[PDB]
Paper text:
FLAPs are in vitro selected RNA sequences that bind and dramatically enhance the fluorescence of fluorogenic ligands which are cell-permeable and exogeneous to the biological system. RhoBAST was specifically optimized from its parental sequence, SRB-2, which was originally selected against sulforhodamine B. biRhoBAST and o-Coral can be regarded as dimeric variants of RhoBAST and SRB-2, respectively.
To facilitate crystallization and phasing, the L2′ or L3′ of RhoBAST were initially replaced with the U1 RNA hairpin loop, resulting in two constructs of L2′-U1 and L3′-U1, respectively. The space group is I212121, and each asymmetrical unit contains three complexes. However, the electron density for the DN moiety of TMR-DN is missing in two of them, likely due to the flexibility of the linker connecting the fluorophore and quencher. Interestingly, the RhoBAST folds into an asymmetric “A”-like architecture, which is organized with a four-way rather than the previously predicted three-way junction consisting of three A-form helices (updated as P1, P2, and P4) and one short pseudo-helix P3 connected by three loops (updated as L2, L3, and L4). The L3 and L4 loops interact extensively, which stabilizes the “A”-like architecture and creates a binding platform for the fluorophore ligand at the tip of the “A”-like structure. The nucleobases of G35 within L3 and C52 within L4 flip out from their residing loops and position into the major grooves of their counterparts (i.e., L4 and L3, respectively), forming two interwoven canonical WC base pairs, G35–C43 and G31–C52, respectively.
Numbering used by the authors: 2 to 102
Write the structure that this text describes.
RNA sequence: GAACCUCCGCCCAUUGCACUCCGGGCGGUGAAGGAGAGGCGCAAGGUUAACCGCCUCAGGUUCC
């Protein structure tokens, strides 16, 4: 019904500072999120449609859940992070589960 | 082995759920001057312009 609240390998963060550059944003996200588990990948775009947002993809769903709870609202580049679970599996995960396309 | 990046900014608009990239406008620096190198296009065309795209490579960084 509301998939953004059902745990997922991938967390969706928005309300990020759009001023920060793509690579710096990716590496700072990794720095703050890697202690919660192994990170398959972190996807950021500076597109009009995708700026201010990032998908952080964990190997273990339990890792996503701990990262979200612990970093909900956390100040990051002067804006409180807003964290959800991704509404659908990231492609790399769909490939693992055998569900891709 | 993989991913991301590789000239420096300003303003306007945007709170947006992607996984092939992709809003608009304006400046500056550098003559060891198209932005790490090569190739190939494309651009440019003299007091000081062009500043881009693709592919390969290199490096930096984060990982496996
Ligand atoms: N090394 C070369 O083969 C070479 C380097 C630089 C120059 C050159 C210019 C070349 C082309 C230009 N336009 C097409 C407008 C302008 C150039 O401007 C300069 C300016 C200066 N200054 C000392 C101010 C030096 C060299 C320039 C060339 C060239 O053929 O002129 C070749
Ligand atoms: O193709 C490289 C890869 O197969 C293996 N290698 C090197 N470093 C690696 C790593 O950090 N992770 C993984 N998974 N695999 C790695 O070695 C091959 C060659 O790499 P080198 O840069 O060492 O090449 P060299 O010519 O020096 O032997
Ligand atoms: N190297 C060089 C310096 C300056 C100029 N110039 O025209 O001013 C030209 C060259 N060149 O190589 O032709
Ligand atoms: Mg260039
Ligand atoms: Mg470049």
């Amino acid at each position: 019904a509301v998939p953004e609240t059902r745990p997922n390998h991938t967390i969706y963060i928005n309300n990020l500072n759009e001023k920060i550059k793509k690579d710096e944003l990716k590496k700072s996200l990794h720095a703050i999120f890697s202690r919660f588990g192994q990170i398959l990948d972190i996807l950021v775009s500076r597109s009009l449609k995708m700026r201010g947002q990032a998908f952080v993809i964990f190997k273990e769903v339990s890792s996503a859940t701990n990262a979200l709870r612990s970093m909900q609202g956390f100040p990051f580049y002067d804006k409180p992070m807003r964290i959800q679970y991704a509404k659908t599996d990231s492609d790399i995960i769909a490939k693992m589960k055998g569900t891709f396309v």
